[PDB]
Design a protein around this ligand. Structure first.
Ligand SMILES: [Mg+2]
Length: 559
């Protein structure tokens, strides 16, 4: 199946390329940069959402599923982009955002008017408690209550995300049919599949039970906010009614997923999705359940990363399918978050790339990952993300569960905007992203980190990623081999083995700044190896003992 063999490039289009000079990346901009993505080697593009939206959550609040936001272009531009992607032998996946809509969606504008409105039950309306307070103690992912009051009708509406993102009612068959109609519209026009936003959220516990509480917080985000009792029923219906009718790829953003939930989503026999994104490997550098959420930061712990990625490799080794990512439009640049983004930036980028791309599953490259883009030094007032603005107010100002200094530090590590400053094309004004004024400033380091210099440098991170993708296409063990964690207890080295029809692929990466030592286990000492890729000058190829330099990475194949 082409999706098992694919390498996906994720574009965040408001920040990819601005062709028309208004500082906002657009769909003609994407068209003009397709050749770049094909030369890198990705064969699937996932486009973050371009549908009409007031941009409260930068597109993830959709006000019209069947039209583009005007700054992206029109539907004609989107149709042309589909054609251009196809002419290049590539596939295009769109972002399906159907847990919620914008509150400016016509459905919601209607729903809120009156209880007798035909769109009332498209959304999730509940009575206040007797004292007027919220139906229950559920919180929003973007701080505060998950419920907002409507004075006109005397009820609260549910929003797991912003108050401008009211949740749809999947108990209503008309809502499910509307979704299906949206899916068909775009698939009939050549969309090759969907990344399904917050897909773990679509089924609610319709009794709306309160969480138990520790009194550490007023509003709680927990186990009711994902993996609802009808979740898989709904996805199986979506497959029967839609997905089974097209040659398509699906990847779910599966909030709340663990390895068993992943099997329910991804086992081919269940006729649901092809693969999901989990957050468990992204969760390893927060406390489990602080009131401060993801902002309660822990240092990078390689043993935790090994444990989690291994659990996922083994759990979907022979059933289901993994995604492989360290970056997207919600995560900081991995090298700044967990590594060295200064003197060892190249080595470190390549090392994280090698660990990820040597595993079983479909790899995802986030725009700019391939050139080693880094987190930004911009001051807090320059950040745009509502998540940060809301968390500052709740955690720092109101509840005082974090100090200002601790919050700023956490934002500088994990803010989503580190992913959203514009793609860095060259060393000219605004890194060549725009001839105008960009919607957010370009990262201050762009003159050193950009496509132009990367393509001039045979040692670039770019050429490394290009090579990793070629190797995947050349060596079917990379796609189909199994997985075994080696030297498991080593606190610096991430090493593992894949095996497929008598061949072996050995991946050894020092994820640390200091020297380390890899010694192959006894059963591999008499293997002969050919080095497929390394991020340091020398060979290769006596892999039974490797004195590892900082961030050294090597992949070998048995011969
Ligand atoms: Mg523009």
């Amino acid at each position: 199946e082409w999706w098992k063999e694919a390498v996906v490039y994720q574009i965040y289009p408001r920040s990819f390329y601005d062709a028309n000079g208004d500082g906002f990346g657009d769909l003609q901009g994407v068209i003009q940069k397709l050749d770049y993505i094909k030369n890198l080697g990705a064969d699937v593009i996932w486009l973050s959402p371009v549908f009409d939206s007031p941009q409260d959550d930068n597109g993830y609040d959709i006000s019209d599923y069947k039209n583009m936001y005007e700054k992206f272009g029109t539907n004609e531009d989107m149709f042309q982009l589909i054609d251009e992607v196809h002419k290049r032998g590539m596939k295009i996946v769109m972002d399906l955002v159907v847990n919620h809509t914008s509150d400016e969606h016509a459905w919601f504008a209607e729903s809120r008017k009156s209880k007798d409105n035909p769109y009332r039950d498209y959304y999730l309306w509940k009575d206040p408690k007797p004292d007027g307070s919220e139906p229950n103690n559920w919180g929003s992912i973007f701080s505060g209550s998950a419920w907002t009051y409507d004075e006109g009708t005397g009820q609260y509406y549910l929003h797991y995300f912003s108050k401008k993102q009211p949740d749809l009612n999947w108990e209503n068959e008309a809502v499910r049919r509307e979704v299906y109609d949206v899916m068909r519209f775009w698939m009939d026009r050549g969309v090759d599949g969907w990344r399904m936003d917050s897909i773990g959220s679509i089924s609610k516990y319709t009794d709306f039970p309160d969480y138990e509480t520790d009194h550490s917080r007023s509003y709680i985000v927990g186990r009711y906010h994902s993996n609802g009792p009808r979740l898989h029923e709904f996805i199986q219906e979506m497959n029967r009614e839609v997905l089974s009718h097209y040659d398509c790829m699906t990847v779910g953003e599966a909030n709340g997923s663990d390895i068993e939930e992943a099997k329910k989503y991804t086992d081919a026999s269940r006729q649901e999705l092809n693969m999901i994104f989990t957050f468990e490997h992204m969760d390893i550098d927060k406390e489990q359940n602080s009131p401060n959420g993801k902002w309660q930061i822990k240092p990078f712990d390689l043993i935790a990363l090994k444990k989690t990625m291994t659990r996922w490799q083994t759990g979907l080794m022979n059933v289901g399918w993994n995604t492989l990512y360290f970056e997207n439009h919600d995560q900081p640049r991995v090298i700044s978050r967990w590594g060295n983004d200064r003197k060892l930036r190249k080595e470190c980028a390549k090392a994280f790339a090698t660990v990820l791309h040597g595993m079983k599953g479909t790899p995802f490259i986030y725009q700019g990952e391939e050139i080693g883009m880094v987190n930004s030094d911009m001051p807090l007032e320059m950040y745009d993300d509502l998540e940060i603005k809301n968390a500052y107010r709740e955690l720092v100002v109101e509840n005082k569960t974090m100090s200002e200094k601790e919050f700023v530090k956490a934002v500088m590590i994990k803010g989503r905007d580190h992913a959203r400053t514009p793609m860095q094309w060259d060393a000219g004004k605004h890194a060549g992203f725009t001839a105008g004024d960009p919607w957010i400033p370009v990262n201050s380091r762009y003159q050193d980190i950009n496509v132009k210099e990367s393509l001039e440098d045979q040692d670039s991170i770019f050429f490394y990623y290009q090579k990793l993708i070629q190797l995947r296409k050349q060596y079917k063990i990379m796609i189909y081999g199994d997985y075994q964690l080696l030297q498991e207890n080593d606190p610096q080295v991430f090493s593992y083995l894949r095996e497929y029809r008598g061949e072996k692929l050995l991946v050894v990466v020092n994820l640390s700044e200091e020297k380390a030592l890899f010694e192959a286990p006894p059963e591999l000492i008499h293997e002969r190896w050919k080095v497929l890729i390394s991020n340091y000058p020398q060979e290769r190829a006596d892999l039974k003992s490797i004195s590892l330099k900082p961030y050294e990475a090597v992949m070998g194949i048995s011969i």
